[PDB]
């Protein structure tokens, strides 16, 4: 349902680098815990009051980072490892999750790394990243540091960025050329916006030329964008971008296209 793709609407090139995913016991336990956390109506009412008051002078992500609500799920250990085509007892040095959020997908990627770095723009979620003992970098610090990261993950940040192609070239700058990969994730159909206070959008200053009407057409359009920076798709998968539930729904899902990119 959420993991299927019509590989005939893909070009012959992309049909070969596809990686199929399915529901995992990790996906299962995430959905279970999100449902039972979506059952407590009184706590959601508390959250709703605080949200309404604070939205008048905060961002929705900042609010959900203040309340510990709305954790998300991209892949599971199994899916992540089989997508990166790595072993369970496989370890490298450096990781950089740009726009890490609350760090729960950074948590799922952490065990295979000795140094886990992160960048975030909501200080409330920055505190949660720091409470997970992550080295918080800046929006202009991860690029000009002196290191060359082994794995860079920009999971679900191009929709929410002001200069995504600039970011892609910046990733190309500080990535290890020989065995360094980029884990990227996009919500297709491409919905790009820059957040503001109270859940308001704002258009980006650099818009990506991902022109299509369904998931398959836009993923066919992505190669050119990745080619401008310096990356080529080596593997990619379809996953659900899941989020915990509120008082109206028990779970939320979005259509994600996850790519692994080569320099």
């Amino acid at each position: 349902q959420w993991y299927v793709c019509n590989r005939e609407k893909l070009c012959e090139s992309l049909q070969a680098v596809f990686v199929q995913s399915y529901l995992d016991q990790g996906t299962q336990i995430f959905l279970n815990n999100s449902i039972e956390k979506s059952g407590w109506l009184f706590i959601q009412l508390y959250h709703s009051f605080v949200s309404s008051v604070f939205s008048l002078f905060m961002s929705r992500t900042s609010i959900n980072g203040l309340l510990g609500r709305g954790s998300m799920f991209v892949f599971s250990p199994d899916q992540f490892q089989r997508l990166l085509k790595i072993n369970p007892d496989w370890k490298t040095h450096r990781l950089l999750d740009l726009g890490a959020g609350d760090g729960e997908v950074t948590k799922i990627m952490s065990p295979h790394f000795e140094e886990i770095y992160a960048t975030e723009l909501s200080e409330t979620m920055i505190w949660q990243l720091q409470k997970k003992k992550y080295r918080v970098l800046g929006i202009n610090e991860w690029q000009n540091t002196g290191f060359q990261y082994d794995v860079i993950s920009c999971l679900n940040l191009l929709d929410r960025c002001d200069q995504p192609l600039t970011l892609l070239k910046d990733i190309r700058s500080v990535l290890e050329p020989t065995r360094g990969r980029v884990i990227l994730a996009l919500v297709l159909p491409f919905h790009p916006y820059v957040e503001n206070v109270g859940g308001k959008w704002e258009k980006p200053s650099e818009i990506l030329e991902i022109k299509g009407q369904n998931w398959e057409e836009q993923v066919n359009s992505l190669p050119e964008v990745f080619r401008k920076a310096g990356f080529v798709i080596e593997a990619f998968t379809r996953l659900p971008y899941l989020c915990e539930g509120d008082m109206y729904n028990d779970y939320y899902v979005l259509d994600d296209a996850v790519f692994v990119l080569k320099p």
């Binding site: 929705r60 609500r69 998300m72 959020g101 929709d159 929410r160 971008y241 939320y252 979005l254």
Partner: peptide, 5 residues
């Protein structure tokens, strides 16, 4: 809702 959006 969804924290992404």
């Amino acid at each position: 809702g969804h924290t992404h959006e």
